[PDB]
Design a protein around this ligand. Structure first.
Ligand SMILES: CC(=O)N[C@H]1CN2CC[C@H](O)[C@@H]2[C@@H](O)[C@@H]1O
Length: 333
């Protein structure tokens, strides 16, 4: 399978629009900031449980300053292209899909009843769920097409299901990835819903964004289960998938907290001076979340910084942009 992605050797920033919507003016200022800081891409997390921030012809939602029309997205892609920045759509499925589901209930109540697993999740074991996913992604691919590099984050974080259900999650991801490849797009997913036993069945051109082996769990029984059953970085190296380091200690920050001088200073200084690209957040042999796991087998250096948006309505675009302008993501081990 073709894998033209270079995200595994790139530096980028992710904006959580699904929790903290932004308009075109603000997103252009983020793109500019990323370019000033020598980043290669900006990832737009366009939907989550809270908000649906892309217009879909199929879903029938109305556009606005923050529900980005195809024309607005095309303008942002053209702006990014002028600054030599890749714009990476990021539309979470099958979970973190509450806003898509609420809209689908209104315009396709039939399809909603078929595909709703829970309030946040489409039923990825059913053919109707893959059909929905490819319909939405095909629409977005066209809006994001007029640039050199084509990547979309499918996500697949925090997915509900049994171990048996997860077998069907692999199939869902692969079918969507193959559809995307037909449209010239590479696909990324998070690591946390990936079983060891499924990893070799996941297409090898799918990039895995590695945030936390435990999914930021502290319950010791959950940790034990994820240590035994969920992918490590060594597992991913053995399977041959590309990796992006999204270490949840070093690379995650809540928009809500921007402007807190000490916290901002620690995050920035740790990122800029202490963190290294081969340092992952994995479970150690003592059952601890070890955010400083050195992986000597990793030869690539990709890092994404994630700005998560819950409960951050009053944080301004200027504050977000100025925080990005402080970042110098490390490139050397
Ligand atoms: C990939 C991932 O981090 N998934 C979720 C869990 N993380 C952990 C830190 C945030 O809650 C963030 C949340 O906003 C995300 O939706």
């Amino acid at each position: 399978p073709r894998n033209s992605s270079t995200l595994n050797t790139s530096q980028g920033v992710m904006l959580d629009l699904g929790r903290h919507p932004l308009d075109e003016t603000a997103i252009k200022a983020v793109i500019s900031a990323a370019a000033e800081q020598h980043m290669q891409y900006v990832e737009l997390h366009l939907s989550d449980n809270e908000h649906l921030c892309f217009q879909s012809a199929y879903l029938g939602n109305a556009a606005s300053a923050t529900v980005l029309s195809a024309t607005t997205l095309e303008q942002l892609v053209a702006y990014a292209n002028q600054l030599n920045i890749e714009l990476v759509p990021d539309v979470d499925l099958p979970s973190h899909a509450g806003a898509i589901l609420r809209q689908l209930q209104q315009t396709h109540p039939d399809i909603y009843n078929t595909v709703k697993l829970d309030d946040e999740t489409i039923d990825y074991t059913k053919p109707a769920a893959i059909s929905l996913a490819t319909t939405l992604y095909g629409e977005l691919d066209a809006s994001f097409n007029n640039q050199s590099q084509h990547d979309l984050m499918l996500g697949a974080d925090e997915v509900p299901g049994s171990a048996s259900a997860y077998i069907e999650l692999t199939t869902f991801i692969n079918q969507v990835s193959r559809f995307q490849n037909q449209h010239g797009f590479n696909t990324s997913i998070w690591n946390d819903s990936l079983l060891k036993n499924e990893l070799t069945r996941l297409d090898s051109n799918i990039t895995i964004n590695y945030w936390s082996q435990s999914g930021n769990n502290t319950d010791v029984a959950i940790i034990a289960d994820r240590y035994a059953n969920r992918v490590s970085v060594p597992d991913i190296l053995a399977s041959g998938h590309p990796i992006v380091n999204c270490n949840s200690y070093a690379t995650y920050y809540q928009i809500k907290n921007i402007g807190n001088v000490n916290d901002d200073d620690y995050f920035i200084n740790y990122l800029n001076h202490t963190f290294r690209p081969n340092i992952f957040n994995e479970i150690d042999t003592n059952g601890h979340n070890q955010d400083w796991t050195i992986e000597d087998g990793v030869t690539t250096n990709g890092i994404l910084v994630s700005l998560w948006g819950a409960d951050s309505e009053h944080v301004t675009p200027t504050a977000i942009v100025n925080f990005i302008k402080r970042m110098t993501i490390p490139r050397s081990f």
